[PDB]
Amino acid sequence: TCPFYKKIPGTGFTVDAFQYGVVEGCTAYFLTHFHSDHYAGLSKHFTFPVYCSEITGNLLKNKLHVQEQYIHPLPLDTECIVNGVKVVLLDANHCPGAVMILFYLPNGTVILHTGDFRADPSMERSLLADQKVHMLYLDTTYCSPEYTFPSQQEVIRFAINTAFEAVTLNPHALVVCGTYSIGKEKVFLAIADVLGSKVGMSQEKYKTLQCLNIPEINSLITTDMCSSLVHLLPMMQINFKGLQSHLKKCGGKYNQILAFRPTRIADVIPQTKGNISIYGIPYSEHSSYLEMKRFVQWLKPQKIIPTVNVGTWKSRSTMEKYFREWKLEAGY
């Protein structure tokens, strides 16, 4: 059955709740972003209203074939009325089109649902700051202090420098980048830009990227693999066997592969077999522990409801202990 943490009390709304059939009482289904665990169950035969960002709506139409009449895109940073309730969509700093949702309940309660997010201090300057928020439905993916990661900018600097050095030393090296969902496009776009190349990919991945409203996208990507020295492959193919196989297909154009898997940064080393090297780089689209803690201590919610790691009693207890520490430290 549909879990409590996907229902919005005092409304006919659910969030990311498409795998449970017709949810009794639901007059509007919100979708925070186009990742498969969240859209699970949506298909071309869905016949209820779906509320989402413009980008998410482009993907629903073109990739899942949801009929146009059921797709309700909303602009960001704008007060909108849906089935008699004021809502705002905010940028989640996750993947393209990903949003947080602010609900202004008829009874005066205000609820924030983060969807999946990477907390940032810039979130402290939006409509979020204009009123008190009582309940927070929180992306707790990395809610433990061992989760430190570098800034996205630091990780991209490492990738650009690594690729440029390798290809300047050997002009016959190919760069390959793994993907299995939308998100983390900066990794392959930044590398291709330093190398003066478009990014080559399958027709299916090209279609997906053409839905994302990226400026000047036609100048950056292509389906002509032969013209490109940065290729995208499915994440499952980023291993010595898959990459050896890909090199054979390039017809003797290349004699080395440098590959990236976007799972201290200065000290990161690759796995190497012969003329193939694979780098795992810590590019995150979710909050680190410290980023999450800063956001929650600024927001000062009355109640937090985790939406990730909820399946075990140990995980639930661990998260509850951190929420109480944070509250006692900051005095709310």
The residues pairing with 10 across neighbouring beta strands, listed in sequence order, are none
Residues numbered 138 to 177 that lie near ligand AXJ (CB under 6 A) are 142-144, 146
Closer of 116 and 258 to Ni ion (Cβ):
116
Q: How far is the CB of 293 from ligand AXJ (least distance, A)?
A: 13
Q: How far is the CB of 318 from ligand AXJ (least distance, A)?
A: 5
Q: How far is the CB of 235 from ligand AXJ (least distance, A)?
A: 21
275 contributes a contact to ligand AXJ by CB under 6 A: no
Q: How far is the CB of 45 from ligand AXJ (least distance, A)?
A: 35
Q: Which residues contact 122 (CB under 8 A, 6 or more apart)?
A: none
35 binds, among ligand AXJ, Ni ion, none (CB under 5 to 8 A by kind): Ni ion
CA atoms within 13 A on the CB side of 83: 17
Return the axis-axis angle of helices 152-169 and 185-194, rounded to nearest 10°: 40
Q: How far is the CB of 144 from ligand AXJ (least distance, A)?
A: 4
Residues before each break in the chain (C–N > 2.5 Å)? 263
Please state the separation of Cα 129 from the chain's center in Å: 23
3-state secondary structure 208-225: HHHCCCCCCHHHCEECCH
Residue linked to tokens 């780098």: 279
Rounded Cα distance between 130 and 237, Å, is 47
35 contributes a contact to Ni ion by CB under 5 A: yes
Closer of 147 and 279 to ligand AXJ (Cβ):
147
- Diameter of the chain measured on Cα atoms: 68
Rounded Cα distance between 41 and 26, Å, is 15
117 binds, among ligand AXJ, Ni ion, none (CB under 5 to 8 A by kind): none
Q: Does residue 52 contact residue 73 with C-beta atoms inside 8 Å?
A: yes
318 binds, among ligand AXJ, Ni ion, none (CB under 5 to 8 A by kind): ligand AXJ
315 binds, among Ni ion, ligand AXJ, none (CB under 5 to 8 A by kind): ligand AXJ
139 contributes a contact to Ni ion by CB under 5 A: no
319 contributes a contact to ligand AXJ by CB under 6 A: yes
Residues numbered 36 to 95 that lie near ligand AXJ (CB under 6 A) are none
Rounded Cα distance between 255 and 163, Å, is 15
Closer of 28 and 143 to ligand AXJ (Cβ):
143
Please state the separation of Cα 98 from the chain's center in Å: 7
Stretch that binds Ni ion, among 31-39, 259-267, 291-299, 312-320 (CB under 5 A): 31-39
Q: What is the DSSP letter of 198?
A: P
Binder of ligand AXJ out of 222, 300, 309, 310 (CB under 6 A): 309
The letter for the amino acid at 223 is T
Q: How far is the CB of 26 from ligand AXJ (least distance, A)?
A: 29
| Tokens coding 248 | 């054979």
Residues of this chain that interact with Ni ion (CB under 5 A) are 35, 116
Residues of this chain that interact with ligand AXJ (CB under 6 A) are 142-144, 146, 309, 315, 318-319
